[PDB]
Amino acid sequence: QDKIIHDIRIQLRKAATELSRWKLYGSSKWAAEALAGLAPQNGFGLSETEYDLYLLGSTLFDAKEFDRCVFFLKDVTNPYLKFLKLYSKFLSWDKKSQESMENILTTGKFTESQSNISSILKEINTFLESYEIKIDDDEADLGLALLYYLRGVILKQEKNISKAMSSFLKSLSCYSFNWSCWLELMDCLQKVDDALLLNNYLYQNFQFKFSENLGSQRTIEFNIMIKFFKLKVFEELNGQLEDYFEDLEFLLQVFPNFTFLKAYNATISYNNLDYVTAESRFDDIVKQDPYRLNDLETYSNILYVMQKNSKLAYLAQFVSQIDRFRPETCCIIANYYSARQEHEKSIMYFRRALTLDKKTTNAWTLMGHEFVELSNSHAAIECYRRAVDICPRDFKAWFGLGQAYALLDMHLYSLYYFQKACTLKPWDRRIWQVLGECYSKTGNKVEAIKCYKRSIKASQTVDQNTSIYYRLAQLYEELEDLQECKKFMMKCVDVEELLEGIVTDETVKARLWLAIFEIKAGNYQLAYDYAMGVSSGTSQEIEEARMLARECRRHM
């Protein structure tokens, strides 16, 4: 610490004010909020005849008259005053840019297209090409980073991810400590192997512009939010972690009582399915900052699994009391309706919350689940698709399509959707088993076993492995490996001893076939032993087991 924390305070004071000055609400809110957690330098290149336009531009933007800003700044040659017009021009297009099929579900009404941004991207390219100083060397300043950032997000609109990464990393090099810039970089991954490749790029190829930044910040490893970059990437997708634990500890010592860290740290527990510890971590945040509402839907999601409806209802009352039209509030209230088995009304509140951001967290998927319980099976699959298009990194979105297509007769489409989610979260025990179950329809028995055997290893607890052992024998029965059927079917009989003789229906089928198999093999005494082992189940199996017992005694 020592001067390191002090140097952060001064530069973070900057990133709080200029970002808020040039109408970047999202980035400035994190930085300004970071001052409170942390334990008037003014300057810009502008002229008096041009300074009025900034006041003219800024105050109209605050009054939300978006379109008039473009006209009043029609001919501006300032390096970064041009950015506010194009930024306003971009949002003016975006509000009317709703895809027809997503809109139908978005509202339920059931009733020039994109060339504008094509001009916007060309306008940025023409300006930078004709601008005096490029990004190279120690030139450029804070304003030029915003242009590249605005350029990058527009490229992402046309699904130009490959060039989008180059633009964003170029912008971050010129100016760092901009949080909104890194959020758009997250959606550009949609893969696991590229993260380490990008990590290699940051460690070796990437370099900072020390001219704008302060001391001890040009270096990548003394930087404080490069740790924030590493925290965010390794929680959206685990993969293989590098210095994740060590770097997390250092950032915790600094930034005391920082709510965002605690919410992220607590969210890690939910991703680890440690529900009991997650609530305690969530609860402390509520006491400290009752009026912070961000990522409170995760709190509602954990309470949904525990089904503590009494606490959840009060949670919904508290959130809705102070604000009634934020996306997390309607999402929490809508999640409440799922607890009351009123899945038919939960759609309306998810519908309302979706219109608020239309790029949310996994609220599209929760919208899809409520249709499944209604048995629409057609709104849900289309609703699931939209979550894929927005965030292709969502496990639940891919899994929803595969599960829904499993109910549909055509199981062919379920293989591909399950395969993508398999790469995203290979650690889950269910997905491998479900993939194998649907893959048995393919008739390629060899690959299911490789999938089936990995399901068994990933299933942890042996008791739940009893059901899938029987699935193994049936597939081996389709091949000339009846001996292999017996040995795994023998294993589930052994698990009965481990599970204190639950003698469930799964082992009832296991016991009768082995007795029949050993009778076919001439082992009457051995088959007679399992004959009395089926002492419970349905009537037919009791009678069938007795005929086997009677037959074995005759042969001895």
Next chain:
Amino acid sequence: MIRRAPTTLQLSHDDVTSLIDDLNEQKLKQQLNIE
């Protein structure tokens, strides 16, 4: 004076069906070698 869209052609049905048939040939013969 105005120009309409110039003539452009896409994948026909005949050629795509021929490629489908070929794909079935090399997805039919290789499992015989495996078996």
Next chain:
Amino acid sequence: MGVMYFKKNEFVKAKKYLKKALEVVKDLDPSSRTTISIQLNLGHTYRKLNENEIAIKCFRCVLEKNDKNSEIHCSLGYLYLKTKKLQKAIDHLHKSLYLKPNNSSATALLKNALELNVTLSLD
């Protein structure tokens, strides 16, 4: 003239004249149904010539120039299906069917992709 020589199944002079046309119009006509059409036709001629390598790149640059087009996506899926890159072509097929409703040939190609995925046992 290039489409003419493509219709007669010559596949050589068509490519030559179309390359001449694009090299004439490299500087100008960045958008507006001229560069897209000429580049798509040259890629289409290359697919017919079985030179799929330059075809992937030219279709990719056309796609990054303009995203909303079912024909370009269908042809790129066809190109990938010519090789063995089914993982990177099925997504294109699904997006192409998303853009345009029927796409019967695209539906057939996607279905065959499903049988291919079913047959294969990649780790």
